[model samples]
Target: SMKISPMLLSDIEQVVELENKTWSEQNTPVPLPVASKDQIIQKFESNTHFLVAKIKDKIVGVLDYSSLYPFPSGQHIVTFGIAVAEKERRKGIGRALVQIFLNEVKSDYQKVLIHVLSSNQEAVLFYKKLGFDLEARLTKQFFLKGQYVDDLIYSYDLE
Candidate 1:
């Protein structure tokens, strides 16, 4: 069974490792830039919300969310980033994490947003299945691996 909870300082190492494995500049059009322990700690200290998925005491997935903008107009919107361990993929862990995130934020925010690489069909489909609709697509937005890839914006309306 997998349990989802707020991330703790001790889980930073494992979360970083999981992130490194899930995203790569070579493969992912817009991979998460590697961060040091202090950077992760800073994020924790800030307003960013981090959630982790654990199985038998091992962290297998992580989700992060923060305010899309600093002003009142953007206060009703939040953007999120998520990843699941490679070995744990296709086991519903990602969906479970996403559902938990939505449930947690629905009352506080008007919408949820995420950006995905157009090349990542699986992720795009997964978001669609979870009620996220494509808001926009930036053509050739990222120069990855000698070619350009589109960046797709997806949003879920809570009200």
Candidate 2:
């Protein structure tokens, strides 16, 4: 059995561990020192939201989101990052997380945006299947693994 809800203060440590497990050289350009508890708390202070998937006492997934911009003009747009425990992958947890995120935030946002590294073709197709269209590609947008990779931006309309 599984449940999804906004993360509680107690959930931060598990969320931090889950993210560290998911981040790898090929998956993100962001270096190590992955997600600290304080960082998550600060995000909360900044009005960001993190939704988690749990089965009993264990957290199996995390999805964090916020307004796409700090200004009024982008208030209607939101962006998110998600990660599922590797052992839980391909179980539809990712889709469930995104669907719930959309349901929770749709009233406040007109669109949802995500960024996928060009190096991650699987994620590109994954977002495509989720009704997000490729909006733009920034060439050599990030330097990682001794080379540069493109940044692929995808968007889904709440309308």
Candidate 3:
């Protein structure tokens, strides 16, 4: 069991490290830009929302979501990014983070959607296991590292 807390600036270093390790540019293309210190800082300056999972005061998982579009018409849909530390995988950290996000946002949104690269099979399985449905498949959508990759959209309809 762990505690979910609002993200603090002090958490940024470990958060950045966790993301870089879990989602390097060579891996999934969705958590695009595994957020070096500079990028994560920029993201914080924007409209994103964050919820971090801590085990005994050490961050083990992180989840952030933001408006998928800038206008009112898109408010019913949202997008999110999540990652857990390597040694903490399969320990319910990631799932707990997402489930809490879902519970918190159900009243405000109709769906939660996010982009994922077709190459990241582990992530694909994770989202699938959580009941997110595949919605779109954009072919060869990203030119990452050294090659082009397909983009997949996974959607979770809030009930």
TM-score of each: 0.93, 0.94, 0.87
lDDT for each residue of candidate 2 in 49-113, tens digit (9 for 90 to 100) = 99999988799999999999999988899999999898988888889999999898889899988
Q: Give per-residue CA lDDT, model 1, range 1-159, as digits (tens).
A: 889999998999988888877777643664476656777788889889998999998999999998888999789998888888888898999899999888889899998877788778779878988889999999998887777888899999988
lDDT of 3 at 74: 91
- Give me the overall lDDT of model 2: 0.88
Clashes of each: 0, 0, 0
TM-score of 2: 0.94
Which TM-score value belongs to model 3?
0.87
Residue 9, candidate 3: Cα error in Å is 2.4
lDDT ranking of the models = 2, 1, 3
Regions of candidate 3 where Cα sits further than 4 Å from its true position: 30-33, 144-148
Give one digit per residue, the lDDT tens place, for model 3 in 1-159.
689888998889989888877776655655555578878778888968889999889988999988788889998888898888888889888888998899889988898888888888778999999999999999998888778888889999885
